[PDB]
Design a protein around this nucleic acid. Structure first.
Ligand SMILES: [Ca+2]
Ligand SMILES: [Ca+2]
Length: 295
DNA sequence: GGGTTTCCACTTATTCAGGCTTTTAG
DNA sequence: CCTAAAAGCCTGAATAAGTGGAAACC
């Protein structure tokens, strides 16, 4: 169907994309390892069309099921990777994932000169993979004995524009309708909530949201051993006047679009004080039921 | 052809999205 | 007293990242 604005695309990849470099034991390879390089996105089935539009925008990649409930877009065909490079050179990433892209590129050149079929290029590919995503396996590090660094330059870049923010929010954003139960007359207080979730490795980027959007807080949550951040807006006037207009102008993608539109219906109802009426409260309840999980 | 590339079927760990309730502001 | 905003959690799962297997190519 329709193509995706390239800056929205980059934001969405900052959210959901990942670069891949496979260094696999291969009895039939002159150096004992074969390699595969690429970029991929894995989403719930409900958003297959997103992956289709990306496929249509770049004219690369392969779409396949990924279990019962996910579907993926994988670009590993070597020449097609040039498209990938050309995109992220012209519309660059800004999360720590940019580091991963910079390693992707570095592997590309190694495989472009065909060095990956010789001892030296394979060794270089191990030294690149050591710093990419989750790094080397135990058996792969024990098979290239040398002292290989895993550390890398932290990325520290600013939000480039509202298109990137629409892509990244389409990925990580949350448009909630919180029904605050109260033993009161009307009972439920309606509270529109905006969240963007992201790991602490990108603190400064989340921080910048406060000033980039002119509203919100940054709060930490955790689960036993892990911790992540939320950018949160709950003051209604920030939402109706600063948050909604931004995504009015820079339209979101995936089913999350429908969640934002519904969120906007309830936000208008709230502007008209109609959430203070049983009539209203009820229409809001119905709207919340068929949005997000209820959809 | 024999290495090597590309594609499919699938799996795992965990950071997201999503949701509650209670407490505080103003 | 009344409603709005914020604090305080807590999970399930959609992500991120990864693998085995083999067809297909060059
Ligand atoms: Ca992400
Ligand atoms: Ca998402």
């Amino acid at each position: 169907r329709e193509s995706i604005n390239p800056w929205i695309l980059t934001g969405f990849a900052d959210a959901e994309g990942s670069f891949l470099l496979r260094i696999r034991n291969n009895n039939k390879s002159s150096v004992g390892y074969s390699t595969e390089l690429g970029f991929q996105i894995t989403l719930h089935n409900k958003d297959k069309s997103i992956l289709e539009n990306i496929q249509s925008t770049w004219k690369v990649g392969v779409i396949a099921n990924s279990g019962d409930n996910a579907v993926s877009l994988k670009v590993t065909r070597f020449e097609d990777l040039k498209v990938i490079i050309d995109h992220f050179e012209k519309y660059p990433l800004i999360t720590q994932k940019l580091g991963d892209y910079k390693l992707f590129k570095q592997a590309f050149s190694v495989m472009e000169n065909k060095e990956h079929l010789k001892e030296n290029g394979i060794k270089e590919l191990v030294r690149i993979k050591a710093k990419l995503n989750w790094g080397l396996t135990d058996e792969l590090k024990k098979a290239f004995p040398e002292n290989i660094s895993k550390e890398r330059s932290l990325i520290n870049k600013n939000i480039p524009n509202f298109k990137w923010l629409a892509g990244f929010t389409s990925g990580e954003g949350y448009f909630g309708v919180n029904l605050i139960k109260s033993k009161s007359k009307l009972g439920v207080q309606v509270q529109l909530v905006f969240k963007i979730t992201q790991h602490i490795k990108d603190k400064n980027l989340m921080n910048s949201l406060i000033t980039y959007l002119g509203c919100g807080y940054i709060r930490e949550s955790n689960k036993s051993e892990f911790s992540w951040l939320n950018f949160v807006v709950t003051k209604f006037s920030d939402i109706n006047d600063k948050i909604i207009p931004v995504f009015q102008e820079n339209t979101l993608i995936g089913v999350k679009l429908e969640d934002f539109e519904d969120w906007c219906k309830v936000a208008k109802l709230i502007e008209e004080k109609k959430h203070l009426t049983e009539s209203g409260l009820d229409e809001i309840k119905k709207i919340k039921l068929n949005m997000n999980k209820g959809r």
